[PDB]
Amino acid sequence: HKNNKSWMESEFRVYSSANNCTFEYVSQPFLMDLEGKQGNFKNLREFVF
Amino acid sequence: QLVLTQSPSASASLGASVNLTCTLSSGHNSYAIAWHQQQPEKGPRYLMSLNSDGSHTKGDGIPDRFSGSSSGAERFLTISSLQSEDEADYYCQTWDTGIRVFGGGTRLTVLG
């Protein structure tokens, strides 16, 4: 927004609405920033499901 | 990536002492930095370098008042007997593998 300039994820387009909820979980994020080091290295993030 | 950190403002009566300072990361303490005088409504005019040892050099058209230094992982720079013509914006810049980076700005509300 221009007046706030704040960025908020208060958007929902992957899902239209919510319903029938079973589980909720709040924790440390899975993807990791880890950025701050310099050079040409890239953030390769690997996952196993 | 890069931290090229600059003071948004520093205030004192006519006679203060900088010529603005830049902060670097732990991994690249020893790389040299440079700045560009983007004074308001004017384009970038190249004045303001720094090597990691603090050896000073003079630009064109401004007095010898200006100095420099170095300590630890950060980079420190100085003037003696501040004058009026230092109203400007500055831009830290170091060198990487084929990249000009150009850092970020120092829009400075120094009260002169």
Added chain:
Amino acid sequence: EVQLVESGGGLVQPGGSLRLACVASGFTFSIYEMNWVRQAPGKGLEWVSYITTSGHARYNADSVKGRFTISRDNSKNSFYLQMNSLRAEDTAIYYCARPQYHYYDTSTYHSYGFDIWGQGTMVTVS
């Protein structure tokens, strides 16, 4: 706008316990990682540590002798450095700075360069 204010001054001995605060206002705290700043009398800046948007820290830069510690209260929109042992050299004003690295950034990464410093709090100790 962007503005930062601080609190938590106090005259104590080395080894003491106080609460240093950098109240962050004018922007969303939930996504902005933050820093802390020391300015010894007539001496230059020495940064200590930071807490990222998630809550991780790094107590490097070797001016700290394993002395300063940091934390986060992300919900109340204030940034805290969890402090103990305020010592003699820490007579300083603490202009704390907002990184410009909101966690949604594109283009060349000159992010988290500090575009604004805090109002400052003077903590005289000797």
